[PDB]
């Protein structure tokens, strides 16, 4: 099914932002991006700059399959999660 890649990406974003898990990347900060569809490249470019972590490693691979101010990785992933769910609903799987 062609919605599998996005479904799995969404599901990974959820897994790594569970309340139980520690604050993502120890509160490292990344460039915020404009979430407007076809933003997978830009999202990868923000995340690939976070060295180590490992918690976002799977998200980084997942974004690869798709490809002026800073915010916490936690907030970045949560805002991206919400956006992708809306894309999923509208049938944008690419």
């Amino acid at each position, epitope marked *: 099914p062609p*919605s599998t890649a996005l*479904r799995e990406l*969404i*599901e990974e974003l*959820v897994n790594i*932002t*569970q*309340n*139980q898990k520690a604050p993502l990347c120890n509160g490292s900060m990344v460039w915020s991006i404009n979430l407007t569809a076809g933003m997978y490249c830009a999202a990868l470019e923000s995340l690939i700059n976070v060295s180590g972590c490992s918690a976002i490693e799977k998200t980084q691979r997942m974004l690869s399959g798709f490809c002026d101010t800073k915010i916490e990785v936690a907030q970045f992933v949560k805002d991206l*999660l*919400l956006h992708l*769910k*809306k894309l*999923f*609903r*509208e*049938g944008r799987f690419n």
Partner: antibody
Amino acid sequence: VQLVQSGAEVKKPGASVKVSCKASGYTFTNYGLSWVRQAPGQGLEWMGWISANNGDTNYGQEFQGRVTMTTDTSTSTAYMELRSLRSDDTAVYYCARDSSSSWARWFFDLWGRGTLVTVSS
Amino acid sequence: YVLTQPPSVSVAPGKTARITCGGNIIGSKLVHWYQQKPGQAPVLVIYDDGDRPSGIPERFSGSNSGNTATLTISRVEAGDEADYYCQVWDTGSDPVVFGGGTKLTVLG
């Protein structure tokens, strides 16, 4: 922007009811309608969805076979017919605006005021 | 797909009420919330996890993470007494799922 529902109906067991829902203030055929019922003092139950664009339908699993949804574009009206009625179909039947998409179901922003159907011998 | 709500929540006037909606990876779904008073149709209060339609008080907010979505109502009033229903779309056998409903009692 409103959904206008037909009046309360009293029906015998085994009869059929057709409830109407008229749309006002928006472009009817750019959306869908979901039907949701509620037996008195109980929860919401989704009955199905119809596209006002093409008349495609998707019925709730518990209602497959028993329900028919139709639209009349000329009057911006949707119809829900429930057949082979039983005492346990006594409920308020609501129509609500939904997306015209056959892929995804959306939130229900606009609701009709509901039509009580009482099923009694 | 199954949504689970507590049947009831009680709250004192002016306090904050929290209503949960549990489902497996509900965080991966867009959650909507309806308020319903007796004799009236449901009213959409929160859509897409945490957005408010126009005319809904800013006292209403929504969160969705992991296996739990939450509707929060700050500074509760007697006019907030109602049944609250969470709702999702699912790609499986039931395309629309409602939670069982939570009765919010405001202890006046």
